[PDB]
Amino acid sequence: NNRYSFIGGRTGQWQVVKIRNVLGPGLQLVEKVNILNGSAWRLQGFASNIRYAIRTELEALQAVQPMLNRAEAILAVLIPIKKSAQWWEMAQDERRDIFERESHHTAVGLEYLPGVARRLLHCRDLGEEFDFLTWFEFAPEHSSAFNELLLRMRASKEWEYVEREVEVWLKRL
Amino acid sequence: NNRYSFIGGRTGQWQVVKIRNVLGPGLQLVEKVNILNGSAWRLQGFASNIRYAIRTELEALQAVQPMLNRAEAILAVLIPIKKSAQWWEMAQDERRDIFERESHHTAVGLEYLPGVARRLLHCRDLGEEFDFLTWFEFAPEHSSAFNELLLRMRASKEWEYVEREVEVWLKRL
Ligand code: HEM
Ligand code: HEM
């Protein structure tokens, strides 16, 4: 099943370390997040096909990207993202050009592998209040680098179209 | 709301003229189709963002494509489609190259506008048994042209990856 739910509340596999309400309405602070394949809030999204990456990029990613659930990867960050109406109205070439040619999303992110594992979920098509649920996990040694990655991405042209962003920092129980 | 359901059964706005089980398991013949925004079978899908078309192609489409619900558009065809796992594993560049560079999907389709109106719905990501629900509607004077179009698309490289396909031909009640 390709659907995942993230329930903020009193139970779950992850302890909430902090929530940073970066842009737009935040998410209520809670004790834990419960993740279900299939309390104060619920987010959901689905795993899907590639929308932007080209073969040579997938090959580079596959050579270095780590798996989820490494024993060492006791920290995670859930980052729900919404992009603007102007973004979604653009054509596929226009969006690819912003994503990679101008913002270097994949090339920059590759600089943080193999430290950081990731998962991308989609939810605009479900009618959710965010467009994406992005998930990252890593060992503590990579926290500083991950915080640097976030600031680099927020400086990019792609991020001019981000209208809501929340960081939910987690620790594996 | 971006979700649509198509219910084959005894009630609805469309009379079934015929069902052609083109490839793979078919759909049960029924009297009518009921279309709901939000019986023998139910199909559902969502309207989404552009995945392939580039800006100059959207411009060409917007110059000529007709609205849905024209008074004369008394015939329709609902065409559920499933593509193979090999298709979905390909990268975005590989899929785009097959879709347009090799198959000329948009260029060929444009030859049948403005006679044929259309809607594309996506449903792989809902876990449905098809990947897309395609909808076409037109006046009887365009039926022969539409049949030509179907034969051209089934001859294309893109259609080498189609693994299930059904035509539900409909008449507006
Ligand atoms: C850690 C290294 C990262 C790598 C290697 C990376 C890689 C990628 C790739 C290859 C895609 C495109 C997938 C596709 O073609 O469908 C993507 C999409 C996306 N990533 Fe990243 N990413 C990283 C970090 C981040 C971070 C830290 C964020 C959030 C702050 C983020 C947010 C997203 C979003 C929102 C999308 C969807 C873009 C859209 O479809 O418009 N990524 N990522
Ligand atoms: C009538 C003229 C037609 C035109 C102008 C046309 C145009 C298009 C366009 C521009 C797209 C890409 C949308 C995007 O970028 O997301 C598309 C997708 C699609 N069309 Fe057509 N189309 C036509 C006829 C047909 C026919 C007759 C069929 C079915 C037999 C069909 C099946 C599909 C499918 C399955 C997709 C999704 C492709 C994918 O995402 O892999 N189209 N069409």
CSV table of C-alpha atoms and ligand atoms in Angstrom, one decimal, chain A residues 92, chain B residues 49-54 58 61 65 79 81 83 87-88 95 99 105-106 108-110 112-113 116-118 120 122 132 134 136 146 149-150 153-154 158-159 165, ligand 2:
chain,number,residue,atom,x,y,z
A,92,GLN,CA,6.2,20.6,-17.1
B,49,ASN,CA,-1.3,18.9,-12.7
B,50,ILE,CA,0.4,18.5,-16.1
B,51,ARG,CA,3.1,15.8,-16.2
B,52,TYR,CA,4.5,16.0,-19.7
B,53,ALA,CA,3.2,18.9,-21.8
B,54,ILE,CA,5.5,21.8,-22.3
B,58,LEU,CA,-0.2,24.0,-23.7
B,61,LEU,CA,-4.0,23.1,-26.9
B,65,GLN,CA,-9.5,22.7,-27.3
B,79,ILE,CA,-11.4,4.7,-21.7
B,81,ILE,CA,-6.0,2.6,-19.2
B,83,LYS,CA,0.4,1.0,-18.1
B,87,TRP,CA,6.7,2.2,-17.9
B,88,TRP,CA,6.4,3.5,-14.3
B,95,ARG,CA,8.8,8.8,-20.4
B,99,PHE,CA,5.2,10.1,-25.0
B,105,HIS,CA,0.7,12.0,-28.5
B,106,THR,CA,-0.1,15.7,-28.3
B,108,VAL,CA,-1.5,13.6,-33.1
B,109,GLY,CA,-4.3,14.4,-30.7
B,110,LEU,CA,-4.3,18.1,-31.7
B,112,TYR,CA,-8.8,15.9,-33.8
B,113,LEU,CA,-9.5,19.2,-32.0
B,116,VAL,CA,-13.1,16.0,-29.6
B,117,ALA,CA,-13.3,17.4,-26.0
B,118,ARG,CA,-11.4,15.5,-23.3
B,120,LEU,CA,-7.7,13.2,-18.1
B,122,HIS,CA,-5.3,9.8,-12.7
B,132,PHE,CA,-6.0,6.6,-15.9
B,134,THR,CA,-9.7,9.1,-20.0
B,136,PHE,CA,-13.8,12.0,-24.6
B,146,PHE,CA,-12.3,9.5,-33.2
B,149,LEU,CA,-7.5,8.5,-33.6
B,150,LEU,CA,-7.8,5.4,-31.5
B,153,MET,CA,-2.6,5.8,-30.8
B,154,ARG,CA,-2.7,2.0,-30.4
B,158,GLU,CA,3.6,4.6,-26.0
B,159,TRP,CA,1.0,1.9,-26.5
B,165,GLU,CA,-7.6,-1.0,-21.8
C,2,HEM,C1,-8.4,13.8,-28.5
C,2,HEM,C2,-7.2,14.3,-28.7
C,2,HEM,C3,-6.2,14.1,-27.6
C,2,HEM,C4,-5.4,15.1,-27.1
C,2,HEM,C5,-5.3,16.6,-27.6
C,2,HEM,C6,-4.6,14.5,-26.0
C,2,HEM,C7,-3.7,15.3,-25.3
C,2,HEM,C8,-3.0,14.8,-24.2
C,2,HEM,C9,-2.1,15.5,-23.4
C,2,HEM,C10,-1.6,16.9,-23.8
C,2,HEM,C11,-1.6,14.7,-22.4
C,2,HEM,C12,-0.5,15.0,-21.3
C,2,HEM,C13,-1.2,15.7,-20.1
C,2,HEM,C14,0.0,16.0,-19.1
C,2,HEM,O1,1.1,16.5,-19.6
C,2,HEM,O2,-0.1,15.6,-17.9
C,2,HEM,C15,-2.4,13.5,-22.5
C,2,HEM,C16,-2.3,12.4,-21.7
C,2,HEM,C17,-2.9,11.2,-21.8
C,2,HEM,N1,-3.8,10.9,-22.8
C,2,HEM,FE1,-4.2,12.0,-24.4
C,2,HEM,N2,-4.9,13.2,-25.8
C,2,HEM,C18,-5.9,12.9,-26.8
C,2,HEM,C19,-6.5,11.7,-27.0
C,2,HEM,C20,-6.2,10.6,-26.2
C,2,HEM,C21,-6.9,9.2,-26.4
C,2,HEM,C22,-7.9,9.0,-27.5
C,2,HEM,C23,-6.5,8.5,-25.4
C,2,HEM,C24,-6.9,7.0,-25.1
C,2,HEM,C25,-7.1,6.1,-26.0
C,2,HEM,C26,-5.6,9.2,-24.6
C,2,HEM,C27,-5.0,8.8,-23.5
C,2,HEM,C28,-4.1,9.5,-22.6
C,2,HEM,C29,-3.4,9.0,-21.4
C,2,HEM,C30,-3.6,7.6,-20.9
C,2,HEM,C31,-2.7,10.0,-20.9
C,2,HEM,C32,-1.8,9.9,-19.7
C,2,HEM,C33,-0.4,9.6,-20.2
C,2,HEM,C34,0.6,9.4,-19.0
C,2,HEM,O3,0.6,10.2,-18.0
C,2,HEM,O4,1.4,8.5,-19.0
C,2,HEM,N3,-5.4,10.5,-25.1
C,2,HEM,N4,-3.3,13.5,-23.6
